[PDB]
Structures are given as C-alpha cells and as structure tokens.
C-alpha cells in the first residue's frame, strides 16, 4: 500500500492506472529522473523519436488510432517543450488530447535564467486546456490525475505537465491501491431535444446528416450508420468524420467543400433543404460563404461544446451533447418514429443521390508518363484491402488523396485537418503503428511533407515498426504553386536540382530512395503508371520481409492543379472530370472493396 | 514619392531601408501576397528552407555572423508560426534578434476558427521583444519601424510580426523618399562610473576581464582587447564572448565554468581576486554556486540592461551601459591612468596565469580504435585556418569542442549557448555562409543534433551553399547517457540498430553518408585517427569542384565520457590530462595559427 | 417557441431560466441594450449602486447568503469592468460565484482604442473560470450557458461577460422552450474511499 517515493514514481502508478502503455519521447538532463521511474516502473513503452516535434506528432497518432487512447510526449526542459507547440496546436484544433510532459529546472531557480529554463506554461496556454508547471511533489499525481479528466473530458484537448528537477526526485508518501481516475463529464441531451430534432428531420423533404469528428471522438460511428439507416436519411462526412459511415455504404452521398470534397457531394449538399449536423462544426474549407451553404436549408447542429454552436452560422436547433449520447436517443425515438408509421419513405431524394454520385466524376485512369497523380490513387484503391488505414496532412498529394482515396471504418483516415503541419505524417504513422501492430497503414506525402521530419524513418528502421509511405514528388511545393497562380506567380516554390550524386532524378533534387536507404528502410521509385501497382506488391513483401517502413516514390509530372475553388458551387475542375466508370474506376459504386 | 501599393508593396520599401538583403522562408496561401511583393521588388534574395524550423535557425545564424545583421524568417499561418518558437526562444535567451513573419487569416475570421489561424501573438509574446497581429494596412510600415528600433536597442531581441490576408493586400498610400529608421536606444556609462570601476581595478592584486556576448553584441571586440592590454589584465570570454580577444593572446586566460571551460580557466579565476565583468551576465554553467564564485572577489558587472545587475549575485560596482559605449571610456580612462604611472605593473599575476594555461591540459592525441572524440578536435585545429568560423549547438560533440577548439575572431563561434535546440547547427551555419560567402563555416555535431533537420542539407544542395561539417558519431545520445550515470542508468539514449542497407556502418543505425549524399551533398566517413586529416583535405577540394555541402563523419567509440562538474572547483576529468604538448599539441601555447 | 429578438433579449431568457432574479450594477452606454432588455422582459430586480465596485460586492454577497444563488453584477464599458476586479479575485480566492457582464466597444472598433474600451478578458482571466469578450449574437445565450455550468461545477468560481455593442443588438432566432440549463459537473468520492477513511 502507502510506501516513500518519489514523486516521480508516483507518477508511474497514476499513468499506469490511467491506462497508459506507451510513450514517445527524447529524453535529457532535466527529464531523466522520470525516464528513471519509467525503467525503474515498467510497463511503458518508451519509442525514441529523431526530433521532438517527431515525438510530439508520435502521440497524436498513437490518440486518434484508438478510441479512448491517449498519446504521451516527453522531453526535457527549454527547446523540447518549445518544439512541442505546433503538436499542442493540431491536436487543440482537431478536439483530441495529447499528455506532453517536459522537464524544468529546479522551482528555486524559476526566474533566474537558468540554463535551458524558459516560461513554457506561457507558451503553451493558447493552444492546451491546461499548461501547468507543478511546483510540489506531492501535487504531481493530482495534476495527471486532473490533467486525465480534462482530455476526456467536454471538448476534448491536450495538456503540458511541466516537471521542475527538484519536484521530480522529492520523496511523498504515495498508495497506487487508493488511486482513482476522475470521473469523466459529458452533457447528454434531453429526450426533449432530441424528439424535436427528429420532428424537424421528418418534416424535411431533402434531408442529410452532415456527420463529424465528434462522431468518431465519441467513438459512436455505429450509432451513426444505424441511425442514417433507420431514416433513410443520406450522410456527408465532413473530413474529419470520414470513415463513420463506409465509403460503400448505399447512403454514403460523397463529402463536401472547397477543397478534400466531391463534385457529387457539393452538388448533394446543395439540393438539399436540410443539413442534420452531428458533431460537426461547420468550417471554413468545408461552407465556403455560410449564406450560400445555408440557403434554402434547416440547420441542426448537435455539438458537445455550446460555444461552438452559433459560432459561425446560425443553427435552427442547437443542442450540447456528447454524440454518442446523442445518437443513443436518436436511434431510440426513430425506432419509435418508424413503428409508428411516422418516418417518410425517401425513396426519390436517395435515388437523386445516388446519380449524382453516378456521375459528377474526376478522372483518375491516366497513362501518361511523367506520372499524373490521380492514377496513384486509383493504384492505391486497387491494391490495398478494404482495412486500409491512410494517414496523411497537407498539400496536393493530400487534397487530391482525399478526393480519390475510399476509407470504410472510422479512424481509417487519420489526417491533422485544421492544423495541417508539414512533418506531421511519418511520426504520426509510426504513433498509429505503435497503437496497432495489426493495422494496415499507408502513408501518402508530397515531397515537401516528406522531408521536413524524413529522419524519423529511422525511428522505424530502429524499432522495427513496418507500414508503407506512398511519397508522390513533383519536385515542388505544389500547393502553393498553385495558389499563386491567383497572383500569377510562381516563386520560391520549386525544390527541383541536379543532384550531383543521382543523375537517374533527372533534376529532381532530393534523392528520396537513397534517403530512405540511408536511414535503414527500404525504398523503390517508379516512374511508369504501369509500374505502381507492381511496386506496391513489391512493397508489401519487403515490409514481411524487413518490418521497416517501406516508401514507394512516384515521379509526377511537376505541375498538376488539383480541383478545388472558392464556394460549394464554384469548384473548379482543371483536370478531366468523368461520367463513367472506365475513367474512374475505383468509385466505390464501381468497385467491390475487399 | 507618394504613390497607392498594397501595404506589403510599403513593407518591402521599408525592409530595403532598414538594410534588409536576406529571407528565409517557407511560402504559403496566407502569405502568399508577400511572396509577390517580394518578386515584384527584388533585392531580397529568399531562401527556401525544407522545415521552417530551419528557416527560423537560418535567420539566427545569419543575424550571429555579422554585426548588425538581422536575419529575417517567414512564414504563412499556422503551424509556420508554432515551428518558429523554439528560434524566438533561442534568439531571446541569447539576447539577439531575428525577424519572424507570418501570414495570417483574414481579420473578420480571426476569433472563429478559420483553418490554419492561431493565436501566434499569444504563444510568441514570451519568447519576443514584441509579437502583434497588424490590424491596419497603414500600421504594416509602422510596426516594422518599432520592430528594428527593438530588435537594435537596449538589451536586444527578436520580433514576430503576424499579417492577416487582407491587411497584406490592401492598399495604402506610402513615400518611400519619406520613410526613415528609427535612432536606436542604448544607455552610455558616465565617467564618474569608469573611473570609478577603473580604480577598484588598480586596487585589484589579480583581476580578470570576463567579457561576455555584450562585447561582441557590441561590435566592441577590439576596444576590449585595448583596454586588456592597456591594463595588462587576463581575459576570460565567457561561452559567448570567446572570439573577441583571439585565443592565442597572451593575456586571454581560457574559459571558465562547469563544462564549457578550461582546467587553467577555472583555476585562474578560483586563483582571482576580482572579476571584471564586461558584458556578460552571470550564467549558472559559468558560474557554479554564485557563493563559490565570488569568494574572496570584488564583482564588477557593466550591462546594457538594468534588470541583469544583480539578478544572480550582488556585484560590488553594477553600471548600465552598452559595452562598446563603456569600453571607449575605459579606454580613455586608463590611458590617463597609464600617463600618470598609477596603472600597477601585473607580470607575476599575468605570468601566474600563463603558467597555469602551459600545464593544465586534457590529452587529445589519441591513436585510438575506434576515434577518441578529442583527437577530431586537434586534427581540426590543425586542418583550419585561424580564420575558421565554427558553427555548433550542444552535445558531448559540442563541449568538447569547446573546450578543445580555438578561434581567434568574434563571431568565429556561432552557438546558441543558453537555449542549445538540437538541430540548430546545419541551418546556422547555412544562414552564417548565406551572411558572409567568403567565411571559412566549420560545424560540429553529434549524430543525434545532425538527425533532427538533416533536411536541411539539401537547402545547401540546392542554392549550392559550401561549408563543411563534421559530425562525430557514437550512434548515442551521449551527453544524456553520461548525465544518466547520476542515476546508475543507461535508458533510451542508444541510436544504434544493424542498418539493413549498410552492413559498413556496423551497427551504428542511421548510414549519414547514404543520407548527405541522397539530400545532394558530398560525404566522406573516417574511422581511424590518421585518416581525419586527409579526409579534411578531400573535404575542401570536394566543396571547391561541387560548391555544396561537405559532411565528414567520424566514427567514434561509443562512450567517452567528457570532463564536467557541478562547481568550478569539482570539474571530473575522466578521459586522461595532459601537462605535456604531445598529449595537447594544438594548444595555442604550442601552437601557431596560421 | 422559436422567434426574432435581439441577442440582450435572449439573455433575459437564459437568465431567467437560470434562476436569476436579481442584478447590481451601474448602467451606461455600452451597456443600455441590456438595461433595456431587463426593461422589457421584467423579472430582474435591479438595484442601482453607487460605485461599481459596490455593485460588485452586493453580488458577491448575494451569492454567499443563500446555497444556490448566483449574485449578478452590470456595468458598462472600460472603468466599470476595472472596477470590477477586486470582487472578481476576492470570489475566486473564496470559491464561490459571481457572474459580471459588462459592456464593451463594437467588434469592429475592438483594437482601435476606442473611447472607454478596454482589453478586460485579459485583466479579468487571473481572477475568474472564465471572462470572454462575446463576438458572436448567437454565441451569447450559448456562453451564458457554459458560464452557469462553470460556476456551479467543480470548484465553483465567477465568470465575466463582455459584450460588444452590436452583438448585444443585433437580432438572432432563439427558442426559450428549448433552452436547458447544462449539468453540474461534481465528482464523488468512492465507497472504497469512504471505508479507508473511516
Ligand atoms: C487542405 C485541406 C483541405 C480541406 N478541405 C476540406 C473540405 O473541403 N471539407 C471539409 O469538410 N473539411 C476540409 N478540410 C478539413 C477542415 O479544415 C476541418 O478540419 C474539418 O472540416 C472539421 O471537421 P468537423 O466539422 O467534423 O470538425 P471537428 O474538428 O472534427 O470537430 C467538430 C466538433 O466536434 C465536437 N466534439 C468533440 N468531441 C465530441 C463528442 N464526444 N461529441 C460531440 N461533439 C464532439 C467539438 O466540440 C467540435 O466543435 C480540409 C483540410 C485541409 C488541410
Ligand atoms: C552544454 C553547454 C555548456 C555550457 N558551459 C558553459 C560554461 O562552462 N561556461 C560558460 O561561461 N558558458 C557555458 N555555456 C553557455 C552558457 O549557457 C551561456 O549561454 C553563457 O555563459 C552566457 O554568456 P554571457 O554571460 O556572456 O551572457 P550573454 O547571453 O552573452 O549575455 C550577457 C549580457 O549581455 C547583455 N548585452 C546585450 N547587448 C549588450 C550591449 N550592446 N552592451 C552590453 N551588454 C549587452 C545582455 O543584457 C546580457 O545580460 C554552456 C552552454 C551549453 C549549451
Ligand atoms: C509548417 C508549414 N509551413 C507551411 C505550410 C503551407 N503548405 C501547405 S501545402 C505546402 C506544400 C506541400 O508540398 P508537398 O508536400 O510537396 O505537396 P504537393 O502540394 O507538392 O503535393 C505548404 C508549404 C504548412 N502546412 N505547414
Ligand atoms: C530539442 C531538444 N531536446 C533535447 C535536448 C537535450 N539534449 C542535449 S544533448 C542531447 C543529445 C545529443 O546527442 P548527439 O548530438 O549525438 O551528441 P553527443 O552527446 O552524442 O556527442 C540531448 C537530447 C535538446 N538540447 N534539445
Ligand atoms: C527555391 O529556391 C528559390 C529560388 O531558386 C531558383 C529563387 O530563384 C527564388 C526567387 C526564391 C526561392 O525560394
Ligand atoms: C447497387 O449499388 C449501387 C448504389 O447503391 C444503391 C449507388 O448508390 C451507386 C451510385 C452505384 C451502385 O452500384
Ligand atoms: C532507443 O530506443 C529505446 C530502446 O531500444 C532498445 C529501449 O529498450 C528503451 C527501454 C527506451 C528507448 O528509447
Ligand atoms: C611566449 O608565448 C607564450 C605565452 O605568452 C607569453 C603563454 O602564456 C603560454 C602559456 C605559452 C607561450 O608559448
Ligand atoms: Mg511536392
Ligand atoms: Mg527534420
Ligand atoms: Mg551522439
């Protein structure tokens, strides 16, 4: 029971208790008494990381693989809790929680400018829920203990537990058998809201659920399904919902915005005269202007969070609630609704639809050489099976991704969507790797992406962790090329140079194979679109092989636009679009997945 | 003159009038709109970066190679902004400034969640001299003048200046002819304070001059070695004053402190009865326990910034005063005194120094297999010109360094010695070349500090960027596993791994050269002592034929653990000393550069 | 049900909802659409104070007297919520709830020092769960809401308000019949817990 330690130890116990097994970290001179504690304890993990920022985009994968887990950084005092910010930041954005813990320099020597001391629970406030220097030992297992709560809890959100040495190696008396996790807090709406928004949902004669993160956050994507099924009632995932529903799935209509969106999606959105939004927010990139995404429409808006109802349009019925709890009841007074003989056919409007997704197409079936980068997507719908997990971030490698690739369970798609720090998709595989030996992960990067964290493929090469890196280059930050065309512009965006060691890059620049060689991976470039989905195959058998990361590299053509625009009706489509399966041949309506 | 441009349009104009040649960068959508304003100008040449952190370093470096440079980073929204706070942190703690630039969301979108917007001016604010969001298109050039009045005056630091879309495009009326920078603040010392200070000097029996980054912050490296030579006084740089009296000077005493310090340096200021502080703050790695240090001395502290005299011992004599400004009156003053014969004759006292610096050595000529850390460092001193311009950042590859290395020149040792981010160095010293083309750039890392942005090397391929780096390679973190040993452990501090494209790395992990010579650069790997030097010397015939980046790597022995302590009377010396020239023959007492 | 009001309008509603009954305070321009929200609505009881800071402690001893009651305190733009400060730290370090709003500038004019426009959700956030300056109508009855919750759960403490100009005038749609006060968030101590104690 009751026994001396130090507060670290007890900080062992208290994570041990809170279900963690695992952590990501670079350990120093102020952080070492707690890796002490943790070899000393057992039962965490520790995965080195190649650079802080690696460690801290390790623990946002490792959080939004599984639900209920929850991703650890470590790093010492000074620049590794400054390195962690922009981890902080994506995981506030996208409501998932991270524990980021940094060493500190002893409380006495605070505001001194000790070495290495900086004010990080300043730095840290605007993007955590709770930034805290703990300044008594026996006040360390309390903070993790509210610090637990918090993640879980309402909105959730990371926090920085920040260690002064001195409060890491006092002694307090600690009983691991009397701790206890807090409770966790999330409203639940009445039975009155929810039979209002069912009512106004009957009334509707183009309804469609727009279903969100929070759905998944929730970890009530069954829930979901069952309740779009029950009312025949069509689903949108915004981005960060994508996966709740299957991408198969006859009521799936396609996703919405100005940029990872579907011509059949907008076009749905548009005819429709109500959005049922579940865990959403509705943002920017996904409304455009919010009087055109709302005209002519009812809007429902269930959130767990008030302040993010009304924050950027006005619902017809806001209600606070965990979506879960939400869906609960939803589906309860459907089925209610529907023994009733109370709920609409709605035969017509999901027949409409469905041909829109018919037909309101992009070309993907390409066999130009350079490589067009459309036809990578339709090679990787081909190749990997229906458990595919694709983890990605930013640029025209991931917009055109989210365009083209199908997902068909939640947390399939992991992907940092309001943040979207270039360097964040190697770590972020390799933390979803680590949550789940078994998923099947693949990774998709531009070239740019790929190098601002490429070192942490050694992490894989160290530790053995195996998934494949699709890496399409263009030898450009591609979209950034083609924003500037709006300024008819092209500058100082081009990564393009004669390598002097690879002539075979053909001015490309970086030579990514040897890169990837060099760091204790495997590697193969294709130049050819026959030759991708070979190269995939290959891939898989090298992973058996090896267990290390694997990177195919497609050479591209350098300048390709990707389809996006402005407002849900003004997307411009600069590449072939398509109204038939031969050119678009891995639409799911087209295609048996798996 | 006066003539209608968009407000991004006038910031040019100003950053051409404030001296401005050099950016660093990574472009983006919302900053897209500067990026245009930049081609549309010219005379900034932009640098792409291939993380932003590296531009941010870029900036540091380039501000750190010569007096009244200020580097300059941008950055679009976002992410950009959270991956510049380690530099702002790094550049503050130094007391040196760099320009950080980000786009931003437009104005009437900042509090909702527009994608990509954070609230950088609330992260930044404790790690800057001023971190704001313009909210005016007219406020763009008026901003950037208070910018370099506070990044030049008083104690000086760095600047983040955050610009929404739509300030940026909007247009302004602004002249040119008309706009002037503003005059820079920095409190001079009154003659009643030197003479003052000059007579506690005289009564001194055996001073030392510890002259400090305010020195060469300054550009007042040769007034301080006047006024040494003036008073026949020893000078002790600290870790960021080393340089501006050259090493082999016959009054400079070494360097004092608990790791970056010499055994003649802390013996002659134990040995001291006064320590003359010029420019300096008092850091705890420089000082140990401030009870230790100033025993027995009378403390002169002579500081730009009111707030540091006294902050962490009480000194005897505190004077505001800008170093420069303070040293043109001590040179005045102690000319008067040496006219009147009141300036003491110092020979024992100097030669009593000097014999400690001839016999207090640590060995470094090893013949060792594998490489003895300490061995690199001679053939370097030996291999390099007195003009060598080293860059490096921290690990056992950067004390050592310190304390085995000699430079003879200010601003010929580029290190971030308060904050140390790993990573720093290949940006550094990318950002010194891009300051001074003519500069002879050397940098030292550790495998781990090279890993973090090994990017960056292609920044160097690219815009072909010659220096050569040295990267010593224990496939550890080794400065962790020797602080580890307090606590009797050796956890998660071990890079190695048999690298399966590399069986000639021997099981050392990541192959560098593999990795330098894919990101466009040139490699060559060493592992017996003989052949560093002619390794050095392919290494310069290589950067002169391909005019990029040189890495040679040195395989070391895996532990050696580097002399340190907690007080400058406890140093260990675990490696063998030295009292001979043969075991320390590049000592400058032996030695002659160049 | 659903109808056309202007956001002030809607916060009676919450307010009442809440429980409220009563408001110290000190009116000004900044704040005269609330005054003529409470005017219109009825309900509120207001007791008119003769220095803001006065205003500030009858609330913080209205919420003392009664297990419950939320003292609510007014005021007006720039001094009325300096003023308010004190009250703001003595029912923090206390643990007990005050709820202030005060008036504010117009978003539009937030950052061009405007005529007694302060940045009071930055002096008032050491000393409260909450302070917000409100930049949306809609978002007004929906910060209140989470403002009740703060003040009831956990450690109780005070929450302040801050409300633009136009976004207490301009008109939202807002339904009275469904607004639902959120629950309180307490934890409870285990039997296991209990027994060790006892
Ligand atoms: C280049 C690029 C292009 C993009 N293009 C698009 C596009 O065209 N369309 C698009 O939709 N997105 C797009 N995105 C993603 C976009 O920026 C947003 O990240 C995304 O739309 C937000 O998803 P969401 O509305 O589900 O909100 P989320 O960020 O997932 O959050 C929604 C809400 O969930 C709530 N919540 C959290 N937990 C719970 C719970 N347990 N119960 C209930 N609610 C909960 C939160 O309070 C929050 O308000 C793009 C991203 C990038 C980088
Ligand atoms: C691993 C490691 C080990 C280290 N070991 C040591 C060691 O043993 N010994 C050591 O000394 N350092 C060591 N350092 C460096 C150390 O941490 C500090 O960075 C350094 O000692 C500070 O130098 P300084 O006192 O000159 O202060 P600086 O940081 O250079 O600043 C000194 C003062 O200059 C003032 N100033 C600025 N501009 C002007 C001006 N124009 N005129 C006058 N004053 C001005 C500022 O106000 C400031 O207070 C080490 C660093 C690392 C990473
Ligand atoms: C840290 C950071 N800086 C800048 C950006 C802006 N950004 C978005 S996409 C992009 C270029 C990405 O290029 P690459 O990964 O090669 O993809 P491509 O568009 O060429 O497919 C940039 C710089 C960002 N998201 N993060
Ligand atoms: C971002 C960051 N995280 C952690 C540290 C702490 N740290 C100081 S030295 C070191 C190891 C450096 O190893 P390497 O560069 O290989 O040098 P070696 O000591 O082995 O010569 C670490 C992790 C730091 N300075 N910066
Ligand atoms: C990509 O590197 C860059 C150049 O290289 C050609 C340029 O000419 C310019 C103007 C900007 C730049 O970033
Ligand atoms: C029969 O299965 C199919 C659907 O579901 C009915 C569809 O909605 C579409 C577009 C195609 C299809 O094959
Ligand atoms: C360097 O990677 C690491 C290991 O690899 C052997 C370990 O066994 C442990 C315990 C920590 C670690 O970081
Ligand atoms: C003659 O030159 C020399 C010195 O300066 C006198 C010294 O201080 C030392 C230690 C050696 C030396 O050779
Ligand atoms: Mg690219
Ligand atoms: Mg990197
Ligand atoms: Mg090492």
Known sequence: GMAKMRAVDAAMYVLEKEGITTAFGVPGAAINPFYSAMRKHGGIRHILARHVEGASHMAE???????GNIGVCLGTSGPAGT???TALYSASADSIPILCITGQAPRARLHKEDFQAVDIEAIAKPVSKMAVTVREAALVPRVLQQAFHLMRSGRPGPVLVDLPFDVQVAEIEFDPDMYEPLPVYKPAASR????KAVEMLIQAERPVIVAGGGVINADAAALLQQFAELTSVPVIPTLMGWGCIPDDHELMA??????????YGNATLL???MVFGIGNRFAQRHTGSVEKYTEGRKIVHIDIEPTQIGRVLCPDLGIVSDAKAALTLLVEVAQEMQKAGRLPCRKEWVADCQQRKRTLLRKTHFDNVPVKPQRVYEEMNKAFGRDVCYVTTI???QIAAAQMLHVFKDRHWINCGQAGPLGWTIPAALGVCAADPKRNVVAISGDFDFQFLIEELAVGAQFNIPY???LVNNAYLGMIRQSQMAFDLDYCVQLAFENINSSEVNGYGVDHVKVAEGLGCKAIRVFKPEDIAPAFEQAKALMAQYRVPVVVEVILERVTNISMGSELDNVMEFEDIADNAADAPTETCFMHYE
């Open 192 to 195: 009155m809201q929810i039979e």
């Open 254 to 263: 396609g996703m919405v915005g100005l940029q990872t969106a579907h011509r």
């Open 61 to 67: 994968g490792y959080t939004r693989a599984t639900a």
């Open 83 to 85: 390195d962690m910010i």
């Open 468 to 470: 494949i890196h699709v």
């Open 395 to 397: 640029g025209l490698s």
């Open 271 to 273: 005819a429709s005269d």
